[PDB]
């Protein structure tokens, strides 16, 4: 069992080592920019007018 588990873990790691990874900076910029396009209309950030709150 355990040996069978180690073989499969090794096989999986051999695949994951080959992935071509993006720079963290680039991914962070894209994450930030996606949020910045939208957080101005996010009800939990900007709040809701009482007259437009369906949970009033």
């Amino acid at each position: 069992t355990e040996k069978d588990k180690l073989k499969m873990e090794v096989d999986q790691l051999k695949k994951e080592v080959t992935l071509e990874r993006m720079l963290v900076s680039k991914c962070c910029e894209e994450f930030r920019d996606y949020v910045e396009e939208r957080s101005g209309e996010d009800p939990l950030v900007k709040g809701i007018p009482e007259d437009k709150n369906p949970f009033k």
């Binding site: 994951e16 963290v24 939208r38 996010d42 950030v45």
Partner: protein
């Protein structure tokens, strides 16, 4: 031993992966957002109290209309609520009361639940009766999410996830690789991939079509109890017994940010993003939900309306409300 060689080889590959991730950590998220203005103090109020369960609540899920929601309690009831009016639409009597998860199908036509019976039960809301009992897991059902009215994905204490054909009741695909109980899963926006979080302290990204693990994400020091995709499908958040939430990036293949404070030492049960992704909401064993600034890692607010653990939460698709469920037997709706 050959066993000796395999253990060292695995550690060597883990180290290669760690080094390759380090080679791409050219900067950090905190630096990148340094010039964004803080969101300011987030102060939500309870707008609706959902009273009716008579024991601990373990899970809830919003319908895609941002109005109906299903909750599951070990009082042996699945309740479907109209959150606008607090009316109960359905109270389903479970065959096994030891429920741990529930899900609302995107169509609104079905709900699912399961737990220590190791079964994922499907209920047709539009005939309420048990439509299907999906049997096959050898350990408790911890989470389930419909792809559509015909397919559902499950996670289990037996360390696997599965994809099911609901009509035939068979596991179409088994997702193997975790070495500890799988506690939570989240479907990608396009439903082509999903991520799972497990008691091996890792999260895994899975390809639905090809039945394989694509990536394994590490960094947590103890169990991952909750996981949720970011809305653009390129990142996800985790909540752990190690008192931290973390943001993980798919294409960087690594952790971007930890959300924690030296004050908080208890476990996290549940995580959700607000609609834009600016806020990350997490439920805690200490009875609170903490609202994090996803870009700055500062705690922006707290939701404190429960007298026992916050066990679950969810944000509506329209972004208008967050629901908390609790071991104190209540759900609350906040905005």
């Amino acid at each position: 031993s050959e066993l000796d060689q395999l253990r060292q080889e695995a550690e060597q590959l883990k180290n290669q992966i760690r080094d390759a991730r380090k080679a791409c950590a050219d900067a950090t998220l905190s630096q990148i957002t340094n010039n964004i203005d803080p969101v300011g103090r987030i102060q939500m109020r309870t707008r609706r109290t959902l009273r009716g369960h008579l024991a601990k609540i373990y899970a809830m899920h919003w319908g895609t209309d941002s109005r109906l929601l299903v909750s599951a309690s070990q009082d042996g009831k699945l309740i479907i609520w109209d959150s606008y009016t607090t009316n109960k639409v359905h109270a389903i009597p479970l065959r096994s009361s030891w429920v741990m998860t529930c899900a609302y199908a995107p169509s609104g036509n079905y709900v699912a639940c399961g737990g220590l019976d190791n079964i994922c039960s499907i209920y047709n809301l539009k005939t309420v009766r048990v439509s299907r009992e999906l049997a096959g897991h050898t350990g408790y059902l911890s989470c389930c999410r419909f792809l559509d009215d015909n397919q559902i994905v499950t996670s289990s204490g037996d360390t696997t996830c599965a994809l099911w054909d609901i009509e035939t009741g068979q596991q179409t695909t088994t997702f193997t690789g975790h070495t500890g109980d799988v506690m939570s899963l989240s479907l990608a926006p396009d439903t082509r991939l999903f991520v799972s979080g497990a008691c091996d302290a890792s999260a895994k990204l899975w390809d639905v079509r090809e039945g394989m693990c694509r990536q394994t994400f590490t960094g947590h020091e103890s169990d991952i109890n909750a996981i949720c995709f970011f809305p653009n499908g390129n990142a996800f958040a985790t909540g752990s017994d190690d008192a931290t939430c973390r943001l993980f990036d798919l294409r960087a293949d690594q952790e971007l940010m930890t959300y924690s404070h030296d004050n908080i030492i208890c476990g996290i049960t549940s995580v959700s993003f607000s609609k834009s992704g600016r806020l990350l909401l997490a439920g805690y064993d200490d009875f609170n939900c903490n609202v994090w600034d996803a870009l700055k890692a500062d705690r922006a607010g707290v939701l404190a309306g429960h007298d026992n653990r916050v066990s679950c939460l969810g944000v509506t698709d329209d972004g208008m409300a967050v629901a908390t469920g609790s071991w104190d037997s209540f759900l609350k709706i906040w905005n």
